[PDB]
Design a protein around this ligand. Structure first.
Ligand SMILES: [Ca+2]
Ligand SMILES: [Ca+2]
Ligand SMILES: [Ca+2]
Ligand SMILES: [Ca+2]
Length: 398
């Protein structure tokens, strides 16, 4: 089991570097000329019997009123969503709990008049009129937002009967003014600064190998209620694809196992060489270099920033756990592991020998004995040739 733990560990570190290089958040930038903002992000929709349907989002927001707004430096929003059902509700519907937090600006230490409209709980009304491939529909929703906690609680109904697209594909269209901006980032909250007059939010959402939604929404106060009024047009969908075919998973209740957390702590340790419970840009750097990469300082800083939910400048184990729960496609993961193979196979002969394995594991800070190295080789060596080929490496690293 201990040669297997060493392979487990190594596979997890290789995958961790890939995930630290991926972009899962909502990336916001200023658009000075338009007195607003742009955003881009990808949503990974789980496909019921396996796989991920990507939805590439592009976004622009512009103020409705004439007053000055806050134009942000580059940052992101991190969103966690739960979709559920009301067992009493006979209409086609969705119950949504969401938490949204601004991050991506590094404080490096542990901890608008519009903003005043958000200091407590605010009631919300949502209205959507859609047309996807000529299928006309309407959604109505109501709830509350509490921007102190970044929290949204809403129930939505399809008021025209059965919803012709899956509910998860509408979540992003169905009030980013309820994001929680940390105290060090209040100057960057464009969304609240545009209130009460509000903003227009426009998106195009490209479902890969399928159709697209284009949306236009007005988000503004009407008296004390924050209202999101939306028109959605979807075109070029496949009648048989994941959207019009209802092939998408509703809720992804999918928490990590105890063994998996156990395995992820061992991977964490391989990064956290000083043992202080944190991974710094330097520690990440050292691991990346022993795996044949040459990241710049700014690239290390960006990688940590992508997962540094608390903005303290380092990755702690909870942050690491969130990151390792990030899905990469079966075939994404794949270039990482190929790269790793080429790094392990020092002479490039297509086999990792025991001497080459030792060399790398040592540089990864496992000091192994002659026997421990042969134990690892034997574990992976399916064809018995005494060395590890690509196909055998894949088996161990996945
Ligand atoms: Ca450390
Ligand atoms: Ca952190
Ligand atoms: Ca070799
Ligand atoms: Ca072999």
């Amino acid at each position: 089991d201990s040669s297997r733990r060493k392979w487990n560990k190594t596979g997890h570190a290789v995958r961790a570097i890939g995930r630290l290089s991926s972009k899962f958040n909502v990336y916001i930038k200023a658009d000075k000329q338009k007195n607003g903002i742009k955003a881009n992000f990808k949503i990974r929709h789980n496909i019921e019997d396996g796989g991920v349907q990507l939805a590439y989002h592009y976004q622009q927001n512009t103020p409705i009123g004439d007053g000055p707004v806050l134009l942000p430096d580059n940052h992101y929003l991190s969103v966690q969503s739960k979709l559920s059902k009301d067992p009493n509700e006979k209409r086609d519907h969705m119950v949504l709990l969401e938490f949204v937090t601004a991050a991506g600006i590094t404080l490096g230490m542990d901890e608008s008049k519009g903003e005043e409209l958000f200091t407590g709980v605010v009631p919300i009304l949502v209205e959507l009129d859609g047309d996807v491939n000529g299928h006309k529909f309407s959604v109505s929703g109501e709830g509350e937002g509490d921007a102190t906690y970044g929290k949204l609680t809403l129930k939505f109904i399809c008021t025209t009967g059965k919803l012709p697209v899956p509910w998860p594909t509408l979540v992003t269209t169905l009030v980013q003014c309820f994001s929680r901006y940390p105290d060090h980032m209040k100057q960057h909250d464009f969304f609240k600064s545009a209130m009460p007059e509000g903003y227009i939010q426009e998106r195009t959402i490209f479902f890969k190998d399928d159709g697209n939604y284009k949306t236009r929404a007005e988000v503004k106060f009407e008296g004390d209620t924050l209202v999101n009024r939306i028109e959605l047009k979807g075109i070029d969908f496949k009648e048989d694809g994941n959207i019009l075919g209802h092939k998408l998973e509703y809720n992804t209740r999918d928490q990590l196992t105890e063994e998996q957390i156990a395995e992820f702590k061992e991977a964490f340790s391989l990064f956290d060489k000083d043992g202080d419970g944190t991974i710094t840009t330097k520690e990440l750097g050292t691991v990346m270099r022993s795996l044949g990469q040459n990241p710049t300082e700014a690239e290390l800083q960006d990688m940590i920033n992508e997962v540094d939910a608390d903005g303290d400048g380092t990755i702690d184990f909870p942050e690491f756990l969130t990151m390792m729960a990030r899905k990469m496609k079966d075939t994404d993961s794949e270039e990482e592991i190929r790269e790793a193979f080429r790094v392990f196979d020092k002479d490039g002969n297509g086999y990792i020998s025991a001497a080459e394995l030792r060399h790398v594991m040592t540089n990864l800070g496992e000091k192994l004995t002659d026997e421990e190295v042969d134990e690892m080789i034997r574990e992976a060596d399916i064809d018995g040739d005494g060395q590890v080929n690509y196909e055998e490496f894949v088996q161990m690293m996945t």
